């Protein structure tokens, strides 16, 4: 990493910086409201 | 941190900022100067004997 990042095959003796550190999502979700509100399709099939 | 303070977390963020080019490495070099120039000044004045 450090090799690349210094774009070179050589580097000399001392302290460096690289990409950093990171964490990936372990997973991915979505969101939903609550229930659902009743339309009046029960009526309409059983209309008389 | 250039990748992450610009568009981080973000799979389309490096492609399209790698294209610009050498940019924010540019930067780095010149907050790595300043970073190791503070640590020569305590040097110069408490630590002459
Ligand atoms: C949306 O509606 C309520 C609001 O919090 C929640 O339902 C809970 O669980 C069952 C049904 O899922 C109910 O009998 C409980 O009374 C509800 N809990 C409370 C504290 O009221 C839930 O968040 C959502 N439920 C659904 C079915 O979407």
Redesign the interface.
Known sequence: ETKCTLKSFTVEKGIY?T??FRVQPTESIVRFPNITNLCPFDEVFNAT | ?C??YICGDSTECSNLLLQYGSFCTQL?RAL?GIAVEQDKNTQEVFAQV
Do not use: A
Request: overall charge neutral; proline content about 0%.
């Open positions: 910086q990409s950093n | 941190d990748t992450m780095k790595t």
